[PDB]
Design an enzyme around this catalytic site. Structure first.
Site, PDB file in Angstrom:
ATOM      1  CE1 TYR A  88      -4.039  -1.906   0.318  1.00 23.45           C
ATOM      2  CE2 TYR A  88      -2.603  -3.345   1.681  1.00 23.45           C
ATOM      3  CZ  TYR A  88      -3.759  -3.137   0.916  1.00 23.45           C
ATOM      4  OH  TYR A  88      -4.598  -4.211   0.756  1.00 23.45           O
ATOM      5  CB  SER A  89       0.989   4.242  -2.106  1.00 27.45           C
ATOM      6  OG  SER A  89       1.050   3.585  -3.371  1.00 27.45           O
ATOM      7  CB  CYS A 269       0.418   6.939  -8.467  1.00 27.07           C
ATOM      8  SG  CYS A 269       0.457   5.669  -7.163  1.00 27.07           S
ATOM      9  CD  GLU A 309       5.183   1.839  -7.273  1.00 28.87           C
ATOM     10  OE1 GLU A 309       5.461   2.509  -6.258  1.00 28.87           O
ATOM     11  OE2 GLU A 309       5.895   0.950  -7.816  1.00 28.87           O
ATOM     12  CE1 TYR A 311      -3.422   0.682  -6.594  1.00 32.83           C
ATOM     13  CE2 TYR A 311      -1.327   1.809  -6.829  1.00 32.83           C
ATOM     14  CZ  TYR A 311      -2.625   1.790  -6.344  1.00 32.83           C
ATOM     15  OH  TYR A 311      -3.267   2.806  -5.644  1.00 32.83           O
TER      16      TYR A 311
HETATM   17  C1  LIG Z   1       2.933  -0.745  -5.326  1.00 28.37           C
HETATM   18  C2  LIG Z   1       1.482  -0.939  -4.951  1.00 28.37           C
HETATM   19  C3  LIG Z   1       0.803   0.026  -4.275  1.00 28.37           C
HETATM   20  C4  LIG Z   1      -0.523  -0.173  -3.884  1.00 28.37           C
HETATM   21  N1  LIG Z   1      -1.119   0.877  -3.221  1.00 28.37           N
HETATM   22  C5  LIG Z   1      -2.374   0.754  -2.924  1.00 28.37           C
HETATM   23  C6  LIG Z   1      -3.018   1.848  -2.192  1.00 28.37           C
HETATM   24  O1  LIG Z   1      -2.436   2.865  -1.861  1.00 28.37           O
HETATM   25  N2  LIG Z   1      -4.333   1.597  -1.868  1.00 28.37           N
HETATM   26  C7  LIG Z   1      -5.093   0.435  -2.206  1.00 28.37           C
HETATM   27  O2  LIG Z   1      -6.279   0.408  -1.889  1.00 28.37           O
HETATM   28  N3  LIG Z   1      -4.457  -0.551  -2.923  1.00 28.37           N
HETATM   29  C8  LIG Z   1      -3.180  -0.443  -3.232  1.00 28.37           C
HETATM   30  N4  LIG Z   1      -2.542  -1.472  -3.892  1.00 28.37           N
HETATM   31  C9  LIG Z   1      -3.313  -2.728  -4.166  1.00 28.37           C
HETATM   32  C10 LIG Z   1      -3.159  -3.622  -2.895  1.00 28.37           C
HETATM   33  O3  LIG Z   1      -1.791  -4.120  -2.816  1.00 28.37           O
HETATM   34  C11 LIG Z   1      -4.110  -4.855  -2.951  1.00 28.37           C
HETATM   35  O4  LIG Z   1      -3.895  -5.467  -4.224  1.00 28.37           O
HETATM   36  C12 LIG Z   1      -5.604  -4.525  -2.974  1.00 28.37           C
HETATM   37  O5  LIG Z   1      -5.874  -3.877  -1.720  1.00 28.37           O
HETATM   38  C13 LIG Z   1      -6.475  -5.816  -2.991  1.00 28.37           C
HETATM   39  O6  LIG Z   1      -5.867  -6.762  -2.043  1.00 28.37           O
HETATM   40  P1  LIG Z   1      -6.930  -7.617  -1.122  1.00 28.37           P
HETATM   41  O7  LIG Z   1      -6.066  -8.482  -0.274  1.00 28.37           O
HETATM   42  O8  LIG Z   1      -8.071  -6.806  -0.652  1.00 28.37           O
HETATM   43  O9  LIG Z   1      -7.585  -8.569  -2.305  1.00 28.37           O
HETATM   44  P2  LIG Z   1      -7.165 -10.114  -2.582  1.00 28.37           P
HETATM   45  O10 LIG Z   1      -7.776 -10.890  -1.476  1.00 28.37           O
HETATM   46  O11 LIG Z   1      -5.756 -10.171  -3.019  1.00 28.37           O
HETATM   47  O12 LIG Z   1      -8.134 -10.306  -3.885  1.00 28.37           O
HETATM   48  C14 LIG Z   1      -7.806  -9.616  -5.137  1.00 28.37           C
HETATM   49  C15 LIG Z   1      -9.117  -9.440  -5.868  1.00 28.37           C
HETATM   50  O13 LIG Z   1      -9.623 -10.780  -6.254  1.00 28.37           O
HETATM   51  C16 LIG Z   1     -11.082 -10.631  -6.078  1.00 28.37           C
HETATM   52  N5  LIG Z   1     -11.399 -12.034  -5.777  1.00 28.37           N
HETATM   53  C17 LIG Z   1     -10.898 -12.707  -4.665  1.00 28.37           C
HETATM   54  N6  LIG Z   1     -11.316 -13.964  -4.641  1.00 28.37           N
HETATM   55  C18 LIG Z   1     -12.093 -14.081  -5.749  1.00 28.37           C
HETATM   56  C19 LIG Z   1     -12.817 -15.238  -6.230  1.00 28.37           C
HETATM   57  N7  LIG Z   1     -12.829 -16.368  -5.563  1.00 28.37           N
HETATM   58  N8  LIG Z   1     -13.440 -15.026  -7.428  1.00 28.37           N
HETATM   59  C20 LIG Z   1     -13.467 -13.792  -8.046  1.00 28.37           C
HETATM   60  N9  LIG Z   1     -12.831 -12.699  -7.671  1.00 28.37           N
HETATM   61  C21 LIG Z   1     -12.163 -12.906  -6.523  1.00 28.37           C
HETATM   62  C22 LIG Z   1     -11.148  -9.912  -4.761  1.00 28.37           C
HETATM   63  O14 LIG Z   1     -12.490  -9.463  -4.546  1.00 28.37           O
HETATM   64  C23 LIG Z   1     -10.189  -8.738  -5.078  1.00 28.37           C
HETATM   65  O15 LIG Z   1     -10.769  -7.798  -5.908  1.00 28.37           O
HETATM   66  C24 LIG Z   1      -1.209  -1.368  -4.261  1.00 28.37           C
HETATM   67  C25 LIG Z   1      -0.519  -2.355  -4.961  1.00 28.37           C
HETATM   68  C26 LIG Z   1       0.800  -2.154  -5.271  1.00 28.37           C
HETATM   69  C27 LIG Z   1       1.507  -3.213  -6.056  1.00 28.37           C
END
Ligand SMILES: Cc1cc2nc3c(=O)[nH]c(=O)nc-3n(C[C@H](O)[C@H](O)[C@H](O)COP(=O)(O)OP(=O)(O)OC[C@H]3O[C@@H](n4cnc5c(N)ncnc54)[C@H](O)[C@@H]3O)c2cc1C
Length: 311
Positions: A88-89, A269, A309, A311
């Site tokens: 998360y940034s 971003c 950056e 994602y």
């Molecule tokens: C450099 C960088 C910076 C970032 N900065 C930010 C930031 O500032 N703020 C921010 O909000 N995010 C940011 N992100 C994204 C963050 O890292 C996460 O990817 C994002 O919050 C989702 O992770 P999660 O664990 O909620 O979802 P996960 O549990 O990883 O799921 C990913 C997606 O899959 C969908 N999904 C899960 N299971 C299923 C299934 N069975 N069938 C269908 N769909 C499904 C979920 O609903 C979700 O949309 C950043 C990413 C990077 C790489």
């Protein structure tokens, strides 16, 4: 008195390189949540929360870096293994929202799953980390790793440089930290006198993040800050319907090009999906001017002015 807020401790300006991977996945730092608040109104298409985490000065970072968060539970498919890190940034400056170097903040959008056909939610499919984060309460513990990233570090060698920042949604995070450093905090060794221009694309008015803060800089630093917004569901037909960030950039294309030709840094971003439209727009603008976007882009990359950056 003076308008810039005092920050401490100033020894955070002494490091010569940014901290990287101070804490790693196998042995994360356990931080404590100080506060969690929703940043959006009722009409937003989903919740985005602001989270303040106390790391007690143990996990320092520079503006533009990210913290990794390991949500509790076992890896859906890694039996006995921990969840993977989500990045998360960081949305605060190195002194953090309480100006004391003990806290960092995150700007997190809840990833909610809906059946496309039935529009029905299925919590078992919701994003794990984002919902765990926006569901947190004061006193809850979080496992942090990092910090990570060097792409979005702010080039400070020229305190009078030009910085054009293009964000969509949570991509605004690093820019909130750059702008507090440029305008709000009393940092003796970094006195900004250039131009910072923030373009922010969101769904609508209720989805704007930190608008009050950015709007304030307009009134205090009218000569050093510009701010333009695009609401994709509440604004303007340009050469096609509705408003995206690219449309705003098109609106100011001559200025932007001029700034880029003079050495401005440009940053993007947020959601990776924002990129193709932007690149189509820049190519079209260049073409109108009788320039090759491809060649310009190669030059901006070579000169290190292009920072992305997504994602
Ligand atoms: C450099 C960088 C910076 C970032 N900065 C930010 C930031 O500032 N703020 C921010 O909000 N995010 C940011 N992100 C994204 C963050 O890292 C996460 O990817 C994002 O919050 C989702 O992770 P999660 O664990 O909620 O979802 P996960 O549990 O990883 O799921 C990913 C997606 O899959 C969908 N999904 C899960 N299971 C299923 C299934 N069975 N069938 C269908 N769909 C499904 C979920 O609903 C979700 O949309 C950043 C990413 C990077 C790489």
């Amino acid at each position: 008195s003076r308008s810039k807020v005092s920050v401490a401790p100033l020894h955070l300006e002494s490091a010569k390189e940014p901290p990287l991977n101070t804490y790693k996945p196998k042995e994360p730092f356990t931080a404590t949540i100080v506060s969690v608040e929703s940043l959006v109104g009722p009409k937003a298409p989903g919740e985005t929360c602001h989270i303040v985490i106390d790391h007690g000065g143990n996990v320092p970072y520079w503006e533009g870096q990210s913290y990794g968060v390991i949500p509790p539970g076992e890896n859906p498919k890694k039996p006995g293994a921990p969840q993977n890190v989500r990045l998360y940034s960081i949305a605060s400056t190195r002194y953090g929202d309480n100006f004391d170097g003990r806290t960092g903040s995150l700007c997190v959008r809840r990833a909610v799953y809906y059946d496309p056909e039935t529009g029905k939610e299925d919590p078992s499919k919701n994003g794990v980390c984002s919902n765990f984060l926006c569901n947190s309460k004061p006193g809850d513990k979080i496992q942090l790793t990092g910090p990570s990233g060097k792409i979005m570090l702010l080039p400070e060698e020229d305190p009078n440089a030009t910085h054009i920042m293009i964000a969509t949604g949570t991509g605004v995070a690093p820019f909130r930290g750059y702008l507090r450093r440029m305008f709000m905090e009393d940092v003796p060794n970094y006195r900004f006198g250039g131009l910072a221009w923030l373009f922010l694309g969101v769904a609508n008015s209720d989805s704007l993040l930190y608008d009050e803060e950015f709007t304030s800089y307009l009134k205090q630093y009218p000569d050093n800050f510009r701010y333009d917004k695009a609401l994709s569901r509440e604004q303007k037909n340009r050469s096609g319907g509705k408003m995206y960030v690219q449309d705003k950039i098109e609106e100011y294309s001559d200025e932007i090009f001029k700034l880029l030709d003079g050495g401005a840094h440009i940053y993007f971003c947020g959601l990776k999906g924002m990129m193709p439209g932007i690149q189509d727009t820049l190519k079209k603008v260049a073409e109108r001017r009788g320039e090759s976007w491809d060649q310009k882009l190669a030059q901006l990359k070579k000169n290190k002015q292009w920072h992305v950056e997504v994602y």
